[PDB]
């Protein structure tokens, strides 16, 4: 009933703050990817939209 | 693993898809 709320505090204390060195790591890898996907989806969407509308 | 008795090749799937896109592209944007 409350033993749980306890074990939580335990792990809650084992929370190692992120090394700014690591943060930037994951930050640059993810952001970089979102751009990869994003750029691609843009290269397709924009021109197709341009068209669908110019013809319409 | 699976119980399916019918395995289809990846390229097949891609194909069908391409078919579907082309046919639909025509249907809708065929009007000139």
């Amino acid at each position: 009933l409350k033993e749980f709320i306890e074990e939580c505090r335990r792990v809650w204390l084992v929370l190692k703050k992120p090394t700014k060195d690591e943060y930037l790591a994951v930050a640059k890898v993810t952001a970089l990817g979102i751009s990869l996907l994003g750029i691609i989806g843009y290269i397709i969407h924009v021109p197709a939209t341009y068209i669908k509308g110019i013809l319409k | 693993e699976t119980f399916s008795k019918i395995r289809v090749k990846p390229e097949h799937v891609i194909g069908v898809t391409v078919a579907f896109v082309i046919i639909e592209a025509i249907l809708t944007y065929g009007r000139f």
């Binding site: 990817g33 843009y42 | 395995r7 799937v13």
Partner: protein, 410 residues
């Protein structure tokens, strides 16, 4: 097992004949990505060029783009997941799941339920009037198209899952969001461009840069959570100094609970809007937009630009539901996957370890879900170009993909 005849009936991409080089896994991934993108450019066939705005909610979770070939994106698949998880997960269905027989059925039964939901959600979608003119034929026609685009997505999913990097559900969600952020920022109607003009006319209409800000905020915030770890000590009480610490990712339960919930919620609004303008407004009452009453009301999410401070009551109740739900799905997930102590043991004498895990795994599970659930809601409160829950899922999806590039780098 009384479904086995059916399972055999369903087609299933061939596992690769032999191993595939990362180079290929990519090319494969690439193609499915591009196909996915092209599919979102084709509208469904409807002699009548028209659609009642859009349910500003179904898309983000679903990787969909309503009014097109992928109008139901991944909805079907996930929705299916929601079910299988509830049933099995809780206990309403017994399954060891460590034995093939079980998985085979489980996995395959989800694969079937998903193919079903394709039309189910397609019917539901058309019914809810995502289109309007219900001419029985054109209506049947659309359902058909709609449903089939999703069936494809189910299979493309499998291709990535066997010949590519990551999964389909993942790729699609990310891909959708990422594209959105980029087109809505640098597209021809790009907020970012709009804002600039205002920075040259001395009349900065914040409303053009605010969302891009949110995106940035939510981003950094979500990345952070993706960096949090738990350091398990290893002070082998042998000699003095023979100490160490094995840090493990904090979001043990992962982010899956966020999709599963956000999905369930979204489904609830679809089904509700459906039962509303059909007959019994059970789950709620909707109007010129969505539901402003009912459970459906209390499961909606206000955002897409900034932080709304009109009805904070909705927020507190919503956040409660989000958190609990996330935890629910969190638990089930950890159970059905293999993140439970019982199983973990085998991998890592038995009960020795097993019982010890049983000491800590459970609390990490609930703590994780709860955390992300919170993180989800706050992300939504802030609002952001992409979705917040979207940027949320995306950040993590992208990352986990990268990791798999490494373990596949070897």
């Amino acid at each position: 097992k009384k479904l086995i005849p059916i399972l055999e009936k369903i087609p299933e991409v061939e596992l690769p004949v032999k191993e595939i080089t990362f180079k290929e896994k990519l090319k494969w991934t690439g193609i499915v990505l591009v196909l996915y993108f092209i599919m979102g450019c084709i509208d469904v066939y409807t002699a009548g060029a028209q659609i009642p705005a859009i349910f500003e909610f179904w898309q983000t979770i679903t990787a969909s783009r309503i009014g097109t070939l992928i109008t139901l994106g991944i909805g079907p698949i996930v929705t299916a997941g929601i079910i299988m998880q509830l049933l099995v997960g809780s206990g309403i269905i017994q399954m060891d799941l460590s034995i093939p027989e079980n998985r085979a059925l489980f996995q395959g039964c989800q694969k079937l339920l998903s193919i079903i939901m394709c039309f189910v959600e397609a019917v539901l979608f058309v019914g809810a009037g995502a289109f309007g003119i219900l001419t029985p034929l054109l209506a049947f026609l659309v359902i058909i198209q709609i449903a089939f685009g999703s069936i494809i997505l189910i299979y493309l999913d499998e291709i990535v899952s066997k010949y590519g990097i990551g999964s389909g559900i993942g790729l699609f969600i990310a891909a959708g969001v990422s594209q959105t952020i980029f087109v809505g920022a640098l597209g021809p109607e790009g907020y970012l461009w709009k804002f600039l003009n205002s920075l040259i006319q001395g009349v900065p209409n914040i409303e053009y840069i605010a969302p891009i800000i949110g995106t940035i905020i939510v981003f950094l915030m979500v990345v952070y959570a993706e960096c949090m770890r738990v350091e398990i000590p290893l002070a082998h009480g042998r000699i003095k100094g023979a100490v160490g610490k094995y840090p493990i990712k904090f979001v043990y339960v992962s982010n899956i609970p966020v999709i599963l919930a956000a999905a369930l919620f979204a489904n609830i609004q679809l089904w509700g809007l459906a039962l509303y303008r059909m007959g019994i407004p059970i789950l709620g009452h909707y109007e010129g937009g969505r539901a402003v009453d009912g459970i459906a009301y209390y499961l909606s999410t206000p955002y897409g630009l900034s932080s709304v401070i009109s009805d904070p009551i909705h927020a507190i109740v919503y956040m409660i539901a989000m958190i609990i739900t996330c935890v629910m799905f969190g638990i089930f997930w950890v159970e059905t996957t293999g993140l439970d102590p019982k199983s973990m043991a085998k991998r890592i004498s038995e009960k020795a370890i097993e019982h010890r895990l049983k000491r800590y795994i459970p609390p990490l599970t609930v703590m994780s879900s709860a955390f992300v659930g919170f993180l989800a809601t706050i992300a939504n409160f802030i609002g952001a170009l992409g979705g917040g829950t979207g940027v949320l899922l995306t950040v993590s999806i992208v990352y986990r993909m990268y990791e798999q590039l490494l373990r596949e780098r070897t």
